[PDB]
Amino acid sequence: MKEVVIASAVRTAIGSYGKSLKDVPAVDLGATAIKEAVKKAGIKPEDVNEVILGNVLQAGLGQNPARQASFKAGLPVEIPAMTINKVCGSGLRTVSLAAQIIKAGDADVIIAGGMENMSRAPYLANNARWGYRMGNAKFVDEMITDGLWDAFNDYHMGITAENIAERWNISREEQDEFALASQKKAEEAIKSGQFKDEIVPVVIKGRKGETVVDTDEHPRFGSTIEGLAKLKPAFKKDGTVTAGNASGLNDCAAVLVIMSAEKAKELGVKPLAKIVSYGSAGVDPAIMGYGPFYATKAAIEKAGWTVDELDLIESNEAFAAQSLAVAKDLKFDMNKVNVNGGAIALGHPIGASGARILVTLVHAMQKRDAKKGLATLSIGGGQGTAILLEKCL
Amino acid sequence: MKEVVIASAVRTAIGSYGKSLKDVPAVDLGATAIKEAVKKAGIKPEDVNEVILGNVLQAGLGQNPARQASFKAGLPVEIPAMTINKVCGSGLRTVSLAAQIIKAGDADVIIAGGMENMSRAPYLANNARWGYRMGNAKFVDEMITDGLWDAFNDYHMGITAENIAERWNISREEQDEFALASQKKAEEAIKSGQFKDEIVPVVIKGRKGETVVDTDEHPRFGSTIEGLAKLKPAFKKDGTVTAGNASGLNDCAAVLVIMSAEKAKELGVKPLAKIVSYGSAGVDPAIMGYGPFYATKAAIEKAGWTVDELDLIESNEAFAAQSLAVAKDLKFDMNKVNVNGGAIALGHPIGASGARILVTLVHAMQKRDAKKGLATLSIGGGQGTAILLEKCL
C-alpha cells in the first residue's frame, strides 16, 4: 500500500522538573513544536488532515489537549484532533497510528508526536465530590499515579527496573557505567551542536520580560563514575537503581509531520526518512522495561532487516537496567546506540519521550548519513513500541 | 482493502450521577463489557490483537486505563492497549480507528469502544506541587474542566448549546418538545425490552452482599410538556437550555468487537454489520454541537450514500438545541432518528457515549431489519465524528 514518510521532526528542549519549562503548559510546548514542524515541512497548515498527539498527565489540562495544542499552533479549526495515552509509548505510537491511517487510505498528512509537562501535574482529592465522611485520606500525586505507578502490582516503575536488574544480574556498576557513557555522549552532542537542527526555542513571556529556552538542561556535565557510585538506591533498600542511573521527571514536546510519499512529492516536500515498519507488544507489567524486545522483533520481522543491518539505534533509557537488558537480548552494537546520549542524561517526559527519541534518530540519520534506523522504548503497564526508518536520499 | 465488521456490541446500563454505578470504577465497567463482548462475538480472549478504548476523565485512574480494563477482563498481558481522548467522540472514534488499523493490514480483531465514570471524577489542586504561597485558590472540579468546559472560550458546553439555539433560532418550546419525545421513546423502548439484548449486567459486590445493575437509570418516565416548561435555565439568565432539554452526567461502558470480514468467516462469527465508512470534522468550538453536520456529510460522501438512503440514525442528544440544528440541516426524517430514545433520556457518559450510540444502533438495525445506519455525535472543542453501518446478510 502507500509509502509513509517523515516530512519534519521538531522538539522543544527537555526541561528538568520544576525548572526551565515549569511555567509552560504541555499544550503550549505542543503548539510551539507543531508550528515549527509545519514550517520545516514546507507545507500549508490547510494541507494537514488530522492531529494525533500523546499526553499522559491529562488531569486538569482541559478538554482534548491535542486539540488545544492544534488550536494554539494556528492550525485551522476544521482539522480533527485526538489525544493518545499509552503511557511511555504514547508519542511514538501516534507516529505508527499516523502511518496506519495513511495506509488505510484516509489521510495524506498527519501531525504526530507527544507533549508532557510533569512539573505542572496536579494533586488529587479522589473523594471530594461525594465526601470522605471521616478519617484521613490520600492527597494523591497525579504524576506518580497516572504516569509512574504500576496499576496491577502497586509499586513504582523503579521496582520494575530492580526486577529486571535482579533477573538478569545487571549490576549497579554496569548500570552506573552505562549512565556515565550516556552523560558523556549527551555533553559531547550538546556542545558540538548535534541538536541545533531539531530544537525549536520556547519563548517565555513572564512579568519582567522574555526568556528563551533552547537547551536541554537535564544532563549532568562532568559526571564521574565515583559520583555515581556514591548515590543511594532510589526505590528499595540495598537496591541497584539510583537517581543517577534512571531518567528524570521532565518536560518537552516533540512533533513530526507524517505524510504519504505521493503527497510529499505533490507538495514539493523533501522527506527526511521513510517509515518502513513498526510494532507494539505487551509483556508482564512487572517487567515492563523489556517490552522493546518483543516490539522490536515484530518490527524487524516486518522490515526484512537484522540488527547488524542498523546504522543508528535510539533505545530509550528509562532505566539503565532495562536499556542494558534489551541491548543484551537484541545484541545491539552499543557504539550505534543513543549516539547523542540518552534519557538518563536528557530526560524522560513521558508522553513525549518516544516522539523525542524519534526526532533525535531522524536528525542523527541525516547528519551522519545513516541508512537504517530503529527507535524503540518501554511502556509502563508492560508494553513496547518500535519504529524502523530508512533515510531518503 | 479488507472489509471490516462488528462482531458484537455490548454496553453496561447508563447510571445517573452519584447513583447506581457510583461505586464502580470506569475500568471495571470497561472490563465487564469487554468480557461479555468477547463471549458474544464467539471468539476467545487470545483472538484479540489490540484494545483501544475511549476515556475522558482519566485523572487519577492510574496508568493506561484501557490497559487496566483489558487486564481486568481476562485478556492476555501480551495484548497492546491504548486510551483515546477525543472528548465526546472518544468511544466512537476508537471504532473507526480499529477499522483503519485492520484496513492497514495490522490486525484482524480489535476491542473498541469507551468507558466513563463521571460520578467518580476527582477534585484537583493545581499548585499543590510547588506551592500556593498565599491566598485562596481554586479547588478544581476535574469533570467540568476536562469534560465539559470549552478550553478556548472559557465557558460551559451549555453555552455552546445556547449559541446554537440563538443562531439557528431554535426556541425553548421546540427544545422541550424534542426532549419530551426522547423521553417517551426511551420509556417505550425500555418497557418493550429493546435494550435487553445489548445491556450486560454489572454486579456490585461489597462487604455484605451483591447488587445487580442492569437498567438505564436516567430516563424520567411520565415526563410532561408542562414539567419541562417550568424548568429554570441551566446556563444563563433567561436561557433556553435547561436540565430537561440537555443530557446528564452519567456512567457507562460500551464495547464492540471489531474484525476483518475474513477473520470473522474463519472463526465462525456471524457479524452484526459492516463498517462502510466514517468521518471526523472540526467546527468553531463556540458551536461545537454542529460538528455532526460536517462529519456526517464526509462519511456519506465516502460511502457513496445519501441521507435519504439511511434506515436508522443515532444522532446523539447532548443538547436538544444541537440535535435539532443538525437534524434540520441534514434533513433527517425524525421518525428514523433515535428510535429507542436519546441521550436527553438515557444520559451522556462522555467517553463511552459514542460507543453507546453505536451499540444501540447496531442492535436496533438487527431487531428492525434495517439495512443502512448512521451514528454521529458532537464533540466538545468543536468536532464531530460519524460511522455508517450496513447490515450483514
Residue numbers in the entry:
A (entry chain B), B (entry chain A): 1 to 393
Question: Which statements did the authors publish about this structure?
Answer:
Here, we present the crystal structure of C. acetobutylicum thiolase (CaTHL), a type II biosynthetic thiolase that catalyses the first step of n-butanol biosynthesis and condenses two acetyl-CoAs to acetoacetyl-CoA. The N- and C-domains form a typical five-layered fold (α–β–α–β–α) observed in other thiolase superfamily of proteins including peroxisomal degradative thiolase from Saccharomyces cerevisiae, β-ketoacyl synthase II from E. coli, and the biosynthetic thiolase from Zoogloea ramigera (ZrTHL)14151617181920.
To further investigate the role of the redox state on the structural properties of CaTHL, the crystal structure of the reduced form of CaTHL was also determined using the C378S mutant CaTHL, a protein that cannot form a disulfide bond. The active state configuration of the reduced form of CaTHL was similar to that of ZrTHL, in which the two cysteine residues involved in the disulfide bond formation in the oxidized form positioned apart with a distance of ∼6.4 Å. The catalytic cysteine loop in the reduced form of CaTHL moved back to the active site by ∼8 Å. Accordingly, the flexible region was found to be highly ordered, forming the native sheet–turn–helix conformation as observed in ZrTHL. In the reduced form of CaTHL, the positions of two catalytic cysteine residues and the conformation of the catalytic cysteine loop were restored, resulting in an active form of the enzyme.
